Design a protein around this nucleic acid. Structure first.
Ligand SMILES: [K+]
Ligand SMILES: [Mg+2]
Ligand SMILES: [Mg+2]
Ligand SMILES: [Mg+2]
Ligand SMILES: [Mg+2]
Ligand SMILES: [Mg+2]
Ligand SMILES: [Mg+2]
Ligand SMILES: [Mg+2]
Ligand SMILES: [Mg+2]
Ligand SMILES: [Mg+2]
Ligand SMILES: [Mg+2]
Ligand SMILES: [Mg+2]
Ligand SMILES: [Mg+2]
Ligand SMILES: [Mg+2]
Ligand SMILES: [Mg+2]
Ligand SMILES: [Mg+2]
Ligand SMILES: [Mg+2]
Ligand SMILES: [Mg+2]
Ligand SMILES: [Mg+2]
Ligand SMILES: [Mg+2]
Ligand SMILES: [Mg+2]
Ligand SMILES: [Mg+2]
Ligand SMILES: [Mg+2]
Ligand SMILES: [Mg+2]
Ligand SMILES: [Mg+2]
Ligand SMILES: [Mg+2]
Ligand SMILES: [Mg+2]
Ligand SMILES: [Mg+2]
Ligand SMILES: [Mg+2]
Ligand SMILES: [Mg+2]
Ligand SMILES: [Mg+2]
Ligand SMILES: [Mg+2]
Ligand SMILES: [Zn+2]
Lengths: 37, 176, 73, 231, 122
RNA sequence: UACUAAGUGGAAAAGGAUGUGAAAGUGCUAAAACAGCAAGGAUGUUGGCUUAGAAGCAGCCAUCGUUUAAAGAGUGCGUAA
RNA sequence: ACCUCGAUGUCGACUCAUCUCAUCCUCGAGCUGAAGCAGGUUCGAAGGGUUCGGCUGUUCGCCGAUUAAAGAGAUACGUGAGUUGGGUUCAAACCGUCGUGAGACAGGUUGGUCCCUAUCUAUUGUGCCCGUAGGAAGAUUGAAGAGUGUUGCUUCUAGUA
RNA sequence: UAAACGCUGAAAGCAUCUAAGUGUGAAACUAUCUCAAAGAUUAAUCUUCCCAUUUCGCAAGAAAGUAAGAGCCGUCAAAGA
């Protein structure tokens, strides 16, 4: 998981969700999990 | 939409007693109990072979509940009528599991013997040492059993070793 | 999300309790402290906070005083 | 939990040789038969405990209120009264000895009042370091250590509560845990406890079930001498 | 109890008459070294016909102590001089013979070669 | 009378986000909308230089045409290709 | 250049430490160009621990041998009514350099006085008086608290995955 | 409970750890371990013992008159300036 101030989809499969009042990015590729949006 | 989705059920064996906050579903299998949280913004109606859930307002949580409980009623009826099953492919070099009484024991790779207690209402069968089938009447309970069995050996990406799910593909890596 | 704080005169003696923990472990102390905070810093406020008998259950050893019953007060 | 307790008087320290070739220092405790003076129940009191009476004395050496209590409860007059928490299962007015309480080699802990030492300094009390003795020195050699936390209005400017300085040391209750009972002497009413017990010889001693190892009993057996008188 | 910067004798055939302790190997602030303890040392007095040279930093194990130590049965073993023998990584003695007696605490910590090459164990 | 769900109120920037409310336009939809599900998803050919090789998915020469509802010198993965 | 020139003792060392986290070790997890072992990065986490020496007044620094680790800072760059005075900075003397000179140099070197019996408050202990509503002697519950919390090696599991 | 991983599930027919419901999870937190603690004036609880006079008037009044216990003093040390 990558913690960045700005989170944006990397591929077309990356999907933005909002969990526990924090926006994260989930995808099939685990290299692209992002948080702290 | 799920909220405005028909729930056509045959009255052959499935009845649904609707109390204030206690929904009871009885059918071929065991009875399922659903709790209604207080001040539920959605009224059910019980016609002949058709249940329709309606709401009072256009609130966000109102729509969310309308969808969620339609899905919950669908899942309860299916489990009561035909149940739910999960399949785990336990694969490895010396991995094997079996069932003794109320405890399912596994020997994956651990010095300490691994045992796991089975909750009420769920039946786990082992036809082959590499195969596990968890059958129950509540979807979330069989899912919890599957995941807590999985937690001992999650499938690694370098080889196939682990407690895999059935028809579940993993991303392969080549560790030269 | 809201915390209640109590510091002893030592270092690190800051004890924190959440709203839920206060509502379960000691709820009488929470109501007592809340009422005390709404009083003027005074030498009579001690007696004023003394006259508040807060109980965590339906029972009370104060039935000998014949206390009148009023709602929402 | 199921806590068992007995009271006695420490009489001294000796050693015993044991099988498996160990020399075990032991403490000897003279344990009088203790009398259960009261039982306090969880339902009626809000907690459960057992209070015994020990160190018996003649009636003329006891005050009027205590002898009245003893004659009201139909008990043997004793000058010492104390209780242990969570001690249940004993009927009022029953003589209790350590043989019925503990096993041959089970683990117990022991509480006793430490040997009084009086007004001691910081080094003897808090294991502090002594200042340098040579290469030039000053009046304070056995210095306690600088108690500065902050000098100036933006800092503490005060000695912090609970500082480590000189004061009273000794005559304080202390507990040593996981001591194995070695032997029982019914005729002399004498208990052998491994290790060292705090307190002066002749002081009171409380033997309790160890909370760290409640049911653990490590075997211990003594050695029988094979010697023979001169040939 | 041999401590830091302690001169002690070597009881083997290696050319080292006086050896100085550098570190009490094993942990942080390990104050003393009792019988059977391993230390790092430096050869300070040596001989021309010796396997070691003066100034080398090496590893040794102590076999004797003047202070002595007490065993479980209660016997207190006490020598009259602190002695150590030079050992190799494998825990094998560097010398071919051991002079004088050695303790039995070596037996507990392996060191079987040292015991078999000694004159008499105590 | 509306708004906020953050104790925001009750301190902050570049930047990021299917938080929510209001408004103004535009596309399709009961001649069926969107998502999902079930099917097909092509031929010359694997075009040709080019590259050990690429030929639906290396750089190119570009960035073909028919059948047909649709199909791309392909959407990726991927195959030495 | 706002406080202090009717005086706020300034480097380093010793003793005692406390606090913060931007975490050195221990603890948990995500990704890996993570086969295993050992790593890299990020996230959570401040309970405890965080070595001894050679040279230098030294902080710093280089080097030696260990350790799980030898963390970054703040607290008048903590701490002289707690210690020392090696350094800086009095008077003495010399070297290099500047000055015609008396003298001068964050150039170098040798030597060279560190006071105070604690009033208040803070703190460590120990008492008298009074209150707790009759008095006294005993045994208790526990609101609010304080103290400790570190970790390594070997064997087996298993030369198994 | 933090980080993290979840199961069942919609808003947003798919998907989705979350919104309802239900879990897992660190030497951190609350207890379990040791010590002290009712001056905790919000001054707690239990047990035992001793008071329960004659007169005058003025009553948590007087003159005398009633006990448990404690202190002063002495010998001391399991204690201690
Ligand atoms: K000044
Ligand atoms: Mg002097
Ligand atoms: Mg002196
Ligand atoms: Mg201020
Ligand atoms: Mg201040
Ligand atoms: Mg704010
Ligand atoms: Mg947005
Ligand atoms: Mg908007
Ligand atoms: Mg100006
Ligand atoms: Mg100032
Ligand atoms: Mg002045
Ligand atoms: Mg002054
Ligand atoms: Mg001063
Ligand atoms: Mg952090
Ligand atoms: Mg803790
Ligand atoms: Mg030297
Ligand atoms: Mg500064
Ligand atoms: Mg300073
Ligand atoms: Mg500093
Ligand atoms: Mg500066
Ligand atoms: Mg000072
Ligand atoms: Mg100083
Ligand atoms: Mg001085
Ligand atoms: Mg001062
Ligand atoms: Mg000087
Ligand atoms: Mg001097
Ligand atoms: Mg001069
Ligand atoms: Mg000149
Ligand atoms: Mg207090
Ligand atoms: Mg799901
Ligand atoms: Mg838990
Ligand atoms: Mg008053
Ligand atoms: Zn992606």
């Amino acid at each position: 998981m990558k913690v960045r101030a700005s989170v944006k989809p990397i591929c077309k499969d990356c999907k933005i969700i909002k969990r526990h009042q924090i926006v994260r990015v989930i995808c099939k590729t685990q290299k692209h999990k992002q948080r702290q949006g | 939409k799920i909220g405005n989705r028909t729930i056509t059920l045959d009255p052959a064996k499935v009845n649904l007693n609707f109390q204030k906050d206690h929904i009871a579903v009885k059918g071929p299998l065991g009875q399922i109990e659903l709790k209604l949280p207080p001040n539920l913004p959605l009224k059910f109606e019980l016609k002949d072979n058709n249940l329709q859930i309606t709401r009072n307002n256009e609130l966000k949580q109102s729509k969310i509940f309308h969808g969620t409980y339609n899905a919950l009623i669908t899942n309860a009826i299916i489990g009561v009528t035909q149940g739910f099953e999960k399949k785990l492919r336990l694969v490895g070099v010396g991995y094997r599991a079996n069932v003794e009484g109320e405890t399912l024991n596994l020997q994956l790779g651990y010095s300490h013997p691994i045992k796991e207690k089975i909750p009420k209402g769920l039946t786990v069968k082992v036809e082959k040492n590499t195969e596990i089938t968890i059958s129950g009447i509540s979807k979330e309970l069989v899912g919890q059993f599957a995941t807590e069995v999985r937690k001992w050996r999650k499938p690694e990406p370098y080889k196939g070793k682990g407690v895999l799910y059935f028809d579940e593909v993993i991303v392969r890596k080549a560790g030269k | 999300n809201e915390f209640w704080y109590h510091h002893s005169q030592y270092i690190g003696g800051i004890k924190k309790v959440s709203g839920r923990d206060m509502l379960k472990k000691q709820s009488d102390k929470l109501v007592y402290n809340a009422v005390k905070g709404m009083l003027p810093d005074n030498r009579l406020s001690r007696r004023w906070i003394t006259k508040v008998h807060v109980f965590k259950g339906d029972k009370h050893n104060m039935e000998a005083q014949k206390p009148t019953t009023l709602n929402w007060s | 939990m199921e806590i068992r307790g007995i009271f006695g008087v420490k009489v001294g320290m000796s050693q015993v040789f044991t099988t498996n070739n160990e020399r075990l220092p032991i403490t000897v405790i003279y344990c009088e038969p203790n009398q259960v003076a009261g039982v306090k129940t969880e339902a009626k009191d809000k907690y459960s405990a057992t209070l015994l009476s020990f160190d018996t004395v003649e009636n003329k050496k006891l005050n009027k209120p205590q002898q009245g209590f003893f004659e009201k409860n139909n008990l043997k007059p004793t000058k010492h009264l104390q209780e242990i928490r969570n001690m249940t299962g004993f009927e009022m007015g029953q003589q209790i000895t350590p043989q019925n309480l503990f096993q041959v080699g089970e683990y117990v802990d022991v509480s006793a009042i430490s040997k009084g030492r009086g007004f001691t300094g910081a080094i003897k009390r808090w294991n502090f370091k002594i200042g340098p003795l040579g290469h030039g020195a000053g009046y304070p050699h056995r210095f306690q250590g600088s108690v500065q936390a902050g000098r100036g209005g933006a800092s503490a400017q005060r000695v912090f509560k609970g500082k480590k300085m000189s004061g009273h040391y000794g005559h304080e209750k202390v507990t040593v845990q996981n001591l194995r009972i070695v032997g029982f002497d019914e005729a002399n009413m004498l208990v052998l406890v491994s290790g060292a017990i705090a307190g002066p010889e002749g002081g009171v001693v409380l033997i309790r079930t160890a909370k760290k190892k409640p049911g653990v009993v490590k075997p211990i057996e003594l050695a029988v001498q094979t010697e023979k008188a001169p040939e | 109890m041999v401590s830091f910067m302690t001169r002690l004798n070597v009881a083997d055939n290696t050319g080292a008459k006086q050896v100085g302790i550098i570190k009490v190997l094993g942990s942080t602030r390990k104050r003393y070294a009792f019988l059977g303890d391993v230390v790092v040392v430096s050869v300070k007095d040596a001989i021309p016909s010796g396997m070691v040279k003066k100034g080398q930093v090496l590893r040794a194990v102590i076999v004797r102590t003047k202070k002595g130590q007490q065993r479980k049965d209660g016997t207190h073993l006490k020598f009259d001089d602190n002695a150590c023998v030079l050992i190799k990584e494998d825990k094998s003695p560097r010398g071919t013979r051991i002079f004088g007696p050695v303790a039995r605490e070596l037996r507990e910590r392996g060191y079987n070669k040292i015991l078999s090459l000694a004159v008499e164990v105590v």
